[PDB]
């Protein structure tokens, strides 16, 4: 067993290098030539807030077992993940690093690293995917606390102590670092924003939200305090080991990749725990645009299967909003979910309604009887209030997916509404501008209906359609229904 | 004295009508022909929330004196305001309607209405403006509670009881209805949103804010509950009369059209009262774009004088943010403010800092050291994050004035920032894309400076300028000094 600085990086990495003239992105979907240039312990900037660079935690923190799974990872990136852990963490807090080789083409990628101090390697004899691989790692772990990292990460100064501090104080917290960006083209390490929380739209794809002005203001007195998050990104977190077991590890029937992050985030919050992001903890990650590995048969389908297994167990009736956003998912078989359902009963978990009200209230939820919801899209433009109020006109701007002035619903009462304002046909003459007015369920001037395969909006009882041809020179108008592009409108969710 | 239904509207309105072929907007800056077609008690839609319409309102409440000032108002609109009051209010809660004629060309506009039940008319023998006219009304009022309305309003069903209920319970509350819109072109009555609060930017012009999602969510259990507001619109409110007197009425040296809404909003909050908007109370108002009457000083100048008189008395050091937004105001003389200052002392009022923290915390305060702020404009386009985060590119979209992804600052550290992200020159080679990264004062790659009369942005220590030529095919770039940008 070799102390990390004595490990021969050139011997390990050299041999798998990008050959003369070949594409440096093909193998990993990031620039391997640029990754291979880097020293295994290369210096990276300290991206932590000023206050971190002196703050503290307790003096007897529990040690962790670090679990890293990989499938055909670049040697330089894997080695660098491992040495960033050994170099930036106090030695007495690292029990071991468990490398789970998830059936990589070449078993030596992992096995050679078993020589390094504290490194244990476990090879799957067939392809299992990240969820079953992580669980194999967790099951072999000796320490009280688990840490999971992707196999292309780089830990920053004092990344670990702030995470451990939290779970040592309360074992029901599941905590993550702020995840810095390692650029997939040049491999520069870039400090991420600290003003983000995790979230998602009704398609159940993970996304980053800025905190609200109210949240930011409440933190002014301690800007590096933990941030409660509705959802974690999923690959980098720290969790009490026994808590991970009690809560049901991961769903063993999810395959390859995607959205075990979704499942575990719902399960923790609904079943009594919490999720946090810890600003003083910084870890870089190579974000990429495409997967470099295979999905039996097809990433689209696997992601939908996994997502369905989460939705059908945890979301109660609100799963129907997911299927409204992704109707093709209804045709994807997802297998037996019984033991996951029995797990939910056994833990006494709160309903998803509770999660929405108390954990993710800023996720905008359609009324139970809404016909459609979300943005109203025309090409790359969206229906927009233009910041106007009652008696004001309405327009378009480029879709920004931030909601706000581009958020609308088609109600049970057949009205197109934003807040308590409704699109109102004030004058039936073609070319007349429409106005925003307070919604009046009786008012027939506010009634609209989808037509032509939910591609347009017609004013009920007329041959008038919503039309953008006047948008920049007065506002949206009512015009005789006809084949123009300016009369095409689609909602992002359709019930 | 005549009951309102017996009043001869055609006789009153019918001499003063828009003559054949003449401009129907000239006299009032709204469509008089369309106003004159309407019956004095014309039906209007009930715009109240469902819950309001089921409530049975208390009627064992203090009566009010309604004060309405006017200067050359259209007869049809003034009559209609008066009858909406008499028709929609329980008779025992109307003590009187005091019409303050602020030196209208024709005194008969007001005097002919003195025949109507409960109407008293007071004529100013010279032009005094709305603030002094309202005070004259208040001074003459016999009831315990004052109600002020503009002379072109229309009260809706059970508009009054919900307002009186609040001040009867606590006399330090100053309360307003939701103000519906009477369209200045067609005179249709239109229901306003109930999700607004009053506010202002540092230029001290009144504006409407939507409540936050959080505020709206807290009210889900009682959606017609009072809404606390940092500021009232100013023309429609109800206030305990003795409270109005003790707090100092209005500043008698403000002229014409103020400013006075700002002053009284600050004074009430800082000096121990509150401001509310009451959803179950609905009153329509003819909003217009221009004033139809004369301003001796301004209008630009009188508005600034009045606003000064408020700022200098109430805002402490924060007045300097007003002057930073409206530097021309520093040259406007505003007269003696001594008795207003003595009033503030006498009442033991809290400082403006308290008001910002406790009443209007959402007003963004440039506690500095910012060099510039707002949108970064190029033609009709604006600098836009494109919803991107750290290590992402940056671009342009059409300016929308909604802030969000088009909001930026130029800091004391000379960085161009959105939230805690900064425009970063990642590569000095001309044509290189710039990226968003976490702000570090250090990173000399993040430093920018305005040049050529604040018309461009140059990267400090280089001959590189910010450039949009690549915007739609990669993002904003750095290029040798599409390079025009203004905050």
């Amino acid at each position: 067993k070799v102390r990390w600085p004595d490990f021969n990086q050139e011997a390990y990495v050299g041999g798998t290098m990008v050959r003369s003239g070949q594409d440096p992105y093909a193998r990993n979907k990031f620039n391997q030539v640029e990754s291979d240039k880097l020293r295994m312990d290369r210096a990276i900037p300290d991206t932590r807030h000023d206050q971190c660079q002196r703050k503290q935690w307790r003096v007897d923190l529990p040690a962790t077992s670090v679990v890293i799974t990989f499938h055909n990872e670049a040697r330089s990136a894997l080695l660098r993940t491992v040495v960033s852990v050994l170099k930036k963490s106090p030695p007495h807090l690292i029990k071991e690093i468990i490398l789970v080789d998830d059936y990589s083409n070449d078993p030596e990628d992992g096995a050679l690293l078993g020589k390094i101090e504290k490194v244990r390697v476990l090879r799957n004899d067939r392809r299992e995917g990240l969820m079953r691989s992580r669980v194999r790692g967790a099951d072999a772990a000796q320490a009280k606390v688990l840490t999971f990292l992707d196999s292309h990460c780089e830990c920053n100064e004092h990344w670990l102590e702030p995470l451990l501090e939290r779970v040592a104080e309360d074992r029901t917290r599941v905590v993550s670092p702020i995840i810095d960006v390692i650029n997939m083209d040049n491999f520069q390490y870039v400090g991420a924003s600290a003003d983000l929380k995790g979230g998602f739209d009704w398609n159940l794809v993970f996304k980053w939200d800025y905190m609200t002005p109210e949240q930011r203001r409440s933190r002014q007195g301690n800007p590096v305090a933990p941030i409660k998050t509705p959802m974690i990104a999923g690959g980098l977190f720290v969790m009490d080991k026994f808590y991970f077991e009690e809560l049901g590890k991961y769903d063993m029937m999810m395959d390859v990749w995607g959205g075990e992050n979704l499942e575990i985030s719902f399960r923790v919050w609904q079943c009594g725990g919490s999720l946090e992001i810890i600003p003083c903890s910084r870890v870089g990650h190579v974000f990429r645009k495409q997967h470099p590995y295979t999905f039996p048969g097809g990433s689209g389908t696997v992601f939908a299967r996994n997502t369905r297994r989460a939705a059908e167990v945890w979301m109660d009736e609100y799963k129907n909003f997911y299927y409204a956003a992704v109707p093709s998912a209804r045709n994807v078989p997802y297998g037996n979910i019984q033991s996951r359902l029995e797990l939910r009963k056994k833990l006494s978990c709160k309903p998803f309604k509770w999660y929405l009200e108390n954990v993710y209230p800023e996720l905008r939820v359609p009324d139970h009887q809404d016909i459609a919801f979300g943005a109203l899209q025309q090409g790359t433009n969206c229906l927009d209030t233009l910041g106007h109020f009652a008696d004001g006109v309405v327009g378009v701007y480029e879709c920004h997916n931030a909601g706000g002035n581009q958020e609308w619903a088609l109600t049970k009462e057949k009205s197109v509404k934003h807040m308590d304002l409704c699109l109102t046909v004030v004058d039936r003459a073609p070319g007349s501008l429409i106005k925003l007015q307070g919604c009046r369920e009786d008012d027939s001037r506010q009634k609209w209906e989808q037509i032509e395969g939910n591609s347009k909006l017609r004013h009920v009882g007329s041959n008038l359609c919503l039309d953008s041809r006047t948008a920049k020179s007065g506002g949206l108008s009512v015009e005789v229904c006809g084949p123009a592009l300016s009369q095409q409108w689609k909602f992002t969710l359709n019930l | 004295k005549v009951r309102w239904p017996d009043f001869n509207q055609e006789a009153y309105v019918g001499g003063t009508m828009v003559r054949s072929g003449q401009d129907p907007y000239a006299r009032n800056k709204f469509n008089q022909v369309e106003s004159d077609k309407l019956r004095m008690d014309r039906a209007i839609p009930d715009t109240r929330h469902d819950q309001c319409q089921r409530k049975q309102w208390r009627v064992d409440l203090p009566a009010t004196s309604v004060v309405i000032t006017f200067h050359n108002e259209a007869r049809s609109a003034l009559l209609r305001t008066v009858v909406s009051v008499l028709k929609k209010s329980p008779p025992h809660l109307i003590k009187e309607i005091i019409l303050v004629d602020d030196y209208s060309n024709d005194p008969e506009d007001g005097a002919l209405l003195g025949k109507i039940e409960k109407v008293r008319v007071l004529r100013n023998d010279r032009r005094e403006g709305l603030m002094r006219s309202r005070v004259r009304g208040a001074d003459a009022a016999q009831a315990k509670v004052l109600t002020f309305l503009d002379s072109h309003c229309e009260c809706n069903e059970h508009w009054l009881e919900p307002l009186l209920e609040r001040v009867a319970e606590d006399r330090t509350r100053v309360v307003s209805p939701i103000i519906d819109v009477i369209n200045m072109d067609n005179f249709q009555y239109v229901g306003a949103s109930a999700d607004l609060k009053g506010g202002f930017d540092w230029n001290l012009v009144f504006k409407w804010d939507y409540m936050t999602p959080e505020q709206r969510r807290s009210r889900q259990g009682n959606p017609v509950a009072p809404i606390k507001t940092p500021m009232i619109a100013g023309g429609l409110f109800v206030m305990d009369k003795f409270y109005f007197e003790e707090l100092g009425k209005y500043d008698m040296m403000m002229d014409v059209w103020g400013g006075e809404n700002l002053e009284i909003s600050f004074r009430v909050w800082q000096c121990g009262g509150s401001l509310e908007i009451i959803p179950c109370s609905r009153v329509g108002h003819v909003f217009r774009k221009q004033h139809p009457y004369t301003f001796p000083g301004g209008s630009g100048t009188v508005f600034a004088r009045n606003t000064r008189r408020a700022a200098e008395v109430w805002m402490d050091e924060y007045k300097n943010f007003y002057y930073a937004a409206v530097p021309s105001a520093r040259n406007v003389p505003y007269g003696n403010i001594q008795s207003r200052l003595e009033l503030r002392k006498k009442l033991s009022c809290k400082p403006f800092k308290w008001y910002l923290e406790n009443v209007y915390p959402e007003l963004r305060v440039p506690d500095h050291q910012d060099i510039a702020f707002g949108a970064l404009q190029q033609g009709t386009n604006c600098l836009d994050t494109l919803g991107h985060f750290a290590d992402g590119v940056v671009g342009v979209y059409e300016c929308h004035n909604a802030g969000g992804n088009q909001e930026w600052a130029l800091t004391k550290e000379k960085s161009v920032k959105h939230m805690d992200l900064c425009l970063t020159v990642v590569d000095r080679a001309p044509g290189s894309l710039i990226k968003l990264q976490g702000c570090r004062e250090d990173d000399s790659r993040q430093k920018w400076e305005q040049i050529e009369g604040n018309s461009k942005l140059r990267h400090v220590g280089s001959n590189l300028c910010l450039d949009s030529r690549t915007a739609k095919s990669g993002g904003l770039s750095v290029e040798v000094c599409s390079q025009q940008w203004k905050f």
Partner: peptide, 7 residues
Amino acid sequence: DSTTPAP
């Protein structure tokens, strides 16, 4: 389909 996106 597509990976975990960038902060």
